[PDB]
mmCIF file of C-alpha atoms in Angstrom:
data_model
loop_
_atom_site.group_PDB
_atom_site.id
_atom_site.type_symbol
_atom_site.label_atom_id
_atom_site.label_comp_id
_atom_site.label_asym_id
_atom_site.label_seq_id
_atom_site.Cartn_x
_atom_site.Cartn_y
_atom_site.Cartn_z
ATOM 1 C CA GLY T 1 24.107 -2.602 -2.930
ATOM 2 C CA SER T 2 21.727 -1.559 -5.489
ATOM 3 C CA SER T 3 22.798 0.240 -8.677
ATOM 4 C CA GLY T 4 18.703 0.841 -9.285
ATOM 5 C CA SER T 5 15.092 0.379 -8.624
ATOM 6 C CA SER T 6 13.406 -1.714 -10.838
ATOM 7 C CA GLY T 7 12.236 -3.978 -8.874
ATOM 8 C CA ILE T 8 9.072 -6.383 -8.880
ATOM 9 C CA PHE T 9 5.967 -7.263 -6.967
ATOM 10 C CA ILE T 10 4.893 -10.478 -6.466
ATOM 11 C CA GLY T 11 1.507 -12.371 -5.088
ATOM 12 C CA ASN T 12 0.235 -15.364 -4.058
ATOM 13 C CA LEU T 13 2.435 -17.142 -2.842
ATOM 14 C CA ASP T 14 2.418 -19.996 -0.270
ATOM 15 C CA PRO T 15 2.795 -20.080 3.159
ATOM 16 C CA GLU T 16 5.205 -23.081 2.809
ATOM 17 C CA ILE T 17 7.404 -20.709 1.255
ATOM 18 C CA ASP T 18 10.656 -18.842 2.762
ATOM 19 C CA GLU T 19 12.872 -16.314 1.764
ATOM 20 C CA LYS T 20 15.445 -18.535 1.311
ATOM 21 C CA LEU T 21 13.520 -20.817 -0.962
ATOM 22 C CA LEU T 22 12.236 -17.445 -3.061
ATOM 23 C CA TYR T 23 15.867 -16.020 -3.533
ATOM 24 C CA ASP T 24 16.721 -18.647 -5.260
ATOM 25 C CA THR T 25 13.764 -19.750 -7.018
ATOM 26 C CA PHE T 26 14.094 -16.625 -8.853
ATOM 27 C CA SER T 27 18.481 -16.386 -8.892
ATOM 28 C CA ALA T 28 17.793 -19.004 -11.783
ATOM 29 C CA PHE T 29 16.432 -15.779 -13.638
ATOM 30 C CA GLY T 30 18.545 -13.529 -12.943
ATOM 31 C CA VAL T 31 20.567 -11.938 -9.420
ATOM 32 C CA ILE T 32 19.343 -10.483 -6.538
ATOM 33 C CA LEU T 33 20.260 -7.331 -5.296
ATOM 34 C CA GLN T 34 19.872 -8.349 -2.125
ATOM 35 C CA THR T 35 17.491 -11.141 0.288
ATOM 36 C CA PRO T 36 14.115 -10.631 -0.571
ATOM 37 C CA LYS T 37 10.661 -9.324 1.603
ATOM 38 C CA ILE T 38 8.183 -10.751 2.815
ATOM 39 C CA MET T 39 4.579 -9.211 3.336
ATOM 40 C CA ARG T 40 3.299 -11.034 6.816
ATOM 41 C CA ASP T 41 0.052 -9.958 8.627
ATOM 42 C CA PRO T 42 0.882 -7.656 11.662
ATOM 43 C CA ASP T 43 -1.264 -10.114 13.175
ATOM 44 C CA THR T 44 -0.164 -13.805 13.139
ATOM 45 C CA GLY T 45 2.960 -12.619 10.759
ATOM 46 C CA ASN T 46 3.214 -15.421 9.431
ATOM 47 C CA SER T 47 2.364 -14.928 5.833
ATOM 48 C CA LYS T 48 0.281 -12.469 4.012
ATOM 49 C CA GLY T 49 0.570 -13.581 0.204
ATOM 50 C CA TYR T 50 2.752 -11.342 -1.488
ATOM 51 C CA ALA T 51 6.176 -10.302 -1.326
ATOM 52 C CA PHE T 52 8.900 -7.751 -2.852
ATOM 53 C CA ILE T 53 11.780 -8.710 -4.387
ATOM 54 C CA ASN T 54 14.410 -6.393 -6.563
ATOM 55 C CA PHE T 55 16.755 -7.678 -9.338
ATOM 56 C CA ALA T 56 20.305 -6.332 -10.086
ATOM 57 C CA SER T 57 18.530 -4.932 -13.324
ATOM 58 C CA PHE T 58 15.750 -4.346 -15.951
ATOM 59 C CA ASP T 59 17.103 -7.204 -18.078
ATOM 60 C CA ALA T 60 16.458 -9.695 -14.693
ATOM 61 C CA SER T 61 13.060 -8.259 -13.990
ATOM 62 C CA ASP T 62 12.003 -8.858 -17.508
ATOM 63 C CA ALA T 63 12.397 -12.779 -17.718
ATOM 64 C CA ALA T 64 10.255 -13.109 -14.873
ATOM 65 C CA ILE T 65 7.316 -10.882 -15.660
ATOM 66 C CA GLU T 66 7.968 -12.391 -18.986
ATOM 67 C CA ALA T 67 7.929 -16.620 -17.738
ATOM 68 C CA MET T 68 7.918 -16.133 -13.530
ATOM 69 C CA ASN T 69 4.181 -14.442 -14.551
ATOM 70 C CA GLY T 70 2.340 -17.334 -14.330
ATOM 71 C CA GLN T 71 4.953 -19.851 -13.007
ATOM 72 C CA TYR T 72 2.425 -22.225 -11.001
ATOM 73 C CA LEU T 73 4.376 -22.387 -7.654
ATOM 74 C CA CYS T 74 3.870 -24.747 -4.985
ATOM 75 C CA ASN T 75 0.052 -24.765 -4.902
ATOM 76 C CA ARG T 76 -0.182 -21.407 -5.862
ATOM 77 C CA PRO T 77 0.256 -19.357 -9.626
ATOM 78 C CA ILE T 78 2.334 -16.677 -8.485
ATOM 79 C CA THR T 79 2.557 -12.795 -10.557
ATOM 80 C CA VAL T 80 5.415 -11.386 -11.200
ATOM 81 C CA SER T 81 4.434 -7.188 -12.394
ATOM 82 C CA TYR T 82 6.671 -4.466 -12.413
ATOM 83 C CA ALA T 83 6.716 -2.679 -8.880
ATOM 84 C CA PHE T 84 6.636 1.037 -10.543
ATOM 85 C CA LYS T 85 6.843 2.402 -13.932
ATOM 86 C CA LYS T 86 6.732 6.358 -15.167
ATOM 87 C CA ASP T 87 5.224 6.201 -18.987
ATOM 88 C CA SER T 88 7.262 7.014 -21.267
ATOM 89 C CA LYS T 89 7.184 9.400 -24.470
ATOM 90 C CA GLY T 90 6.179 8.267 -27.443
ATOM 91 C CA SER T 91 2.696 8.469 -29.498
ATOM 92 C CA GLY T 92 3.620 7.196 -32.727
ATOM 93 C CA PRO T 93 3.667 7.746 -36.237
ATOM 94 C CA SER T 94 -0.595 7.144 -36.778
ATOM 95 C CA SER T 95 -3.118 8.397 -39.863
ATOM 96 C CA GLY T 96 -6.312 7.788 -38.360
#
Protein backbone atom coordinates (compact mmCIF):
# COMPACT_ATOMS: atom_id res chain seq x y z
CA GLY A 1 0.00 0.00 0.00
CA SER A 2 2.04 2.91 1.32
CA SER A 3 4.31 3.71 4.27
CA GLY A 4 5.12 7.39 3.84
CA SER A 5 4.39 10.36 1.59
CA SER A 6 7.77 10.64 -0.14
CA GLY A 7 6.41 11.32 -3.62
CA ILE A 8 8.28 12.79 -6.58
CA PHE A 9 7.19 15.16 -9.35
CA ILE A 10 8.27 14.56 -12.95
CA GLY A 11 7.99 16.95 -15.88
CA ASN A 12 8.78 17.10 -19.59
CA LEU A 13 7.64 13.55 -20.37
CA ASP A 14 7.41 12.33 -23.96
CA PRO A 15 3.84 11.76 -25.20
CA GLU A 16 5.01 8.35 -26.42
CA ILE A 17 5.62 7.09 -22.88
CA ASP A 18 3.02 5.08 -20.96
CA GLU A 19 2.38 4.33 -17.28
CA LYS A 20 3.79 0.86 -17.93
CA LEU A 21 7.12 2.18 -19.21
CA LEU A 22 7.68 4.83 -16.54
CA TYR A 23 6.97 2.27 -13.82
CA ASP A 24 9.92 0.21 -15.05
CA THR A 25 12.09 3.08 -16.28
CA PHE A 26 12.06 4.24 -12.66
CA SER A 27 11.70 0.84 -10.99
CA ALA A 28 15.38 0.37 -11.84
CA PHE A 29 16.45 2.88 -9.20
CA GLY A 30 13.99 1.93 -6.48
CA VAL A 31 10.70 0.14 -5.87
CA ILE A 32 7.42 1.87 -6.71
CA LEU A 33 4.58 1.89 -4.18
CA GLN A 34 1.84 1.66 -6.81
CA THR A 35 1.15 2.21 -10.51
CA PRO A 36 2.31 5.71 -11.54
CA LYS A 37 0.02 8.48 -12.78
CA ILE A 38 0.40 10.90 -15.69
CA MET A 39 -1.32 14.29 -15.88
CA ARG A 40 -3.30 14.61 -19.11
CA ASP A 41 -5.15 17.56 -20.65
CA PRO A 42 -8.91 17.77 -19.99
CA ASP A 43 -9.35 18.36 -23.72
CA THR A 44 -7.46 15.70 -25.67
CA GLY A 45 -6.64 13.57 -22.64
CA ASN A 46 -3.50 12.22 -24.29
CA SER A 47 -0.62 13.74 -22.32
CA LYS A 48 -0.15 17.05 -20.51
CA GLY A 49 3.60 16.93 -19.98
CA TYR A 50 4.11 16.15 -16.30
CA ALA A 51 3.49 13.04 -14.20
CA PHE A 52 3.42 12.01 -10.54
CA ILE A 53 5.16 8.99 -9.02
CA ASN A 54 5.71 7.85 -5.43
CA PHE A 55 8.54 5.61 -4.24
CA ALA A 56 8.70 3.21 -1.29
CA SER A 57 10.97 5.42 0.82
CA PHE A 58 13.06 8.59 0.58
CA ASP A 59 16.20 6.55 -0.06
CA ALA A 60 14.69 5.64 -3.42
CA SER A 61 13.52 9.16 -4.25
CA ASP A 62 17.02 10.45 -3.53
CA ALA A 63 18.63 8.21 -6.15
CA ALA A 64 16.29 9.50 -8.86
CA ILE A 65 16.48 13.20 -7.97
CA GLU A 66 20.23 12.58 -8.13
CA ALA A 67 20.41 10.76 -11.46
CA MET A 68 16.89 10.80 -12.89
CA ASN A 69 17.13 14.57 -12.44
CA GLY A 70 18.05 15.36 -16.04
CA GLN A 71 18.19 11.84 -17.46
CA TYR A 72 17.65 12.27 -21.20
CA LEU A 73 14.35 10.48 -21.78
CA CYS A 74 12.65 9.64 -25.08
CA ASN A 75 13.74 12.84 -26.83
CA ARG A 76 12.71 14.72 -23.69
CA PRO A 77 14.86 15.73 -20.68
CA ILE A 78 12.92 14.76 -17.56
CA THR A 79 13.26 16.54 -14.21
CA VAL A 80 12.75 14.89 -10.82
CA SER A 81 11.96 17.16 -7.88
CA TYR A 82 10.53 16.29 -4.46
CA ALA A 83 6.77 16.85 -4.69
CA PHE A 84 6.70 18.57 -1.29
CA LYS A 85 9.24 19.29 1.45
CA LYS A 86 8.96 20.76 4.95
CA ASP A 87 11.72 23.14 6.01
CA SER A 88 13.64 21.42 8.81
CA LYS A 89 15.30 23.04 11.82
CA GLY A 90 19.05 23.62 11.76
CA SER A 91 20.72 26.99 11.28
CA GLY A 92 24.29 25.93 12.02
CA PRO A 93 27.21 27.31 14.06
CA SER A 94 28.25 30.56 12.37
CA SER A 95 30.31 33.56 13.46
CA GLY A 96 29.93 36.05 10.63
